[PDB]
């Protein structure tokens, strides 16, 4: 196939162009709602943590696939491992609200706590980049899912439910230094 390149129209040639045959494909695993629905770690927890999804690792599965979109919407699930009770306040709450049990408070069971949180931001969508400020490198302070608090939190996991992504951005792979391709060890049985 030949076409006008500078017009930027999408062109999809087939193997039928020289006698081949396009085969049936199944793309269940690259579905946006499917791939973002797994628990991923948040490796900076405090006694008080504000749930911000831009704190996932930038090279993880969900972390990187979230950096590869401009806007997003999602509910949330969290798995917290804490001592004492765990208080959650929604988006917009004072920081002093986290010391009272009128808010969602979880009395700790043995292994950990697994909750489901809604989307409470005042905006229709959240963003991973922001060109500018919001007061009178840093996103607006209203780009969060709430805050949690315990006497000490050991680990935090998050999961995106009903995820929707908009306006894709670059997504990079590890760079090849001098090789012909990036070679690494792949699992193979012993002996």
């Amino acid at each position: 196939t030949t076409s006008a390149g500078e017009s930027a129209d999408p062109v999809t040639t087939t193997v039928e162009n020289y006698g081949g045959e396009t085969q049936v494909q199944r793309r269940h695993h690259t579905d946006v709602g499917f791939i973002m629905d797994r628990f991923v770690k948040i490796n900076n927890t405090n006694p008080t943590h504000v749930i911000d999804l831009m704190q996932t690792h930038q090279h993880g599965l969900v972390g990187a696939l979230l950096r590869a979109a401009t806007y997003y919407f999602s509910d949330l699930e969290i798995v917290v491992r804490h001592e004492g009770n765990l208080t959650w306040v929604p988006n917009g709450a004072p920081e002093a609200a986290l010391s009272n049990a009128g808010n969602p408070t979880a009395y700790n069971k043995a292994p950990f706590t697994r909750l489901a949180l809604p989307y409470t931001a005042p905006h229709r969508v959240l963003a991973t980049v922001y060109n500018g400020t919001s007061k009178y490198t840093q996103l607006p302070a209203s780009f969060n899912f709430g805050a949690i608090r315990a006497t000490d939190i050991s680990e935090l996991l998050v999961r995106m439910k009903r995820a929707e992504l908009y306006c894709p951005r670059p997504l990079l792979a590890v760079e090849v230094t001098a090789q012909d391709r990036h070679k690494q060890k792949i699992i193979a049985p012993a002996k």
């Epitope: 490796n43 900076n44 927890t45 491992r81 001592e83 000490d152 050991s154």
Partner: nanobody, 125 residues
Framework: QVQLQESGGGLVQAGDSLRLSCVPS????????MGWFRQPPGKEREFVAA????????KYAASVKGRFAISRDVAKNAAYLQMNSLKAEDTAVYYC??????????????????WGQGTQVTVSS
């Protein structure tokens, strides 16, 4: 399961500094707590300083609070105990440890799982 590789021991004299390191053999996705135990000559093992893997939550002993400093390298999966302004009492056998099973601050110095053979640090005067 997991074996610990220690580095950086040796001999110094009072007033200098030393740097101990420890890297575990496997890089499993756990929240382990790297710590340092020391055993003085003719005395029993005791806790010095620990650090959590997730955050930089550091515990310390009353003996070594302002002098010693512990850190972790997320990339290289290591931990370093920067010993400063050593005293002649700091002569001991320094051991690292793992403590994989529970990672709460209140218990961060009581029950470790994998030790790894100790290093020798003998400061002179």
């Amino acid at each position: 399961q997991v074996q610990l590789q220690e580095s950086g021991g040796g001999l110094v004299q009072a007033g200098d500094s030393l740097r101990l390191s420890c890297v575990p053999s496997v890089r499993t996705s756990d929240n382990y707590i790297m710590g340092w135990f020391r055993q003085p000559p003719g005395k029993e093992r005791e806790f010095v300083a620990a650090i959590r893997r997730s955050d930089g939550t550091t515990k310390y002993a009353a003996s070594v609070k302002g002098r010693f400093a512990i850190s972790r390298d997320v990339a290289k999966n290591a931990a370093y105990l920067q010993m400063n302004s050593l005293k002649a009492e700091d002569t001991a056998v320094y051991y690292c440890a793992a403590k994989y099973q529970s990672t709460f601050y209140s218990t961060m110095d009581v029950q470790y799982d994998y030790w790894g053979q100790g290093t020798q640090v003998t400061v002179s005067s």
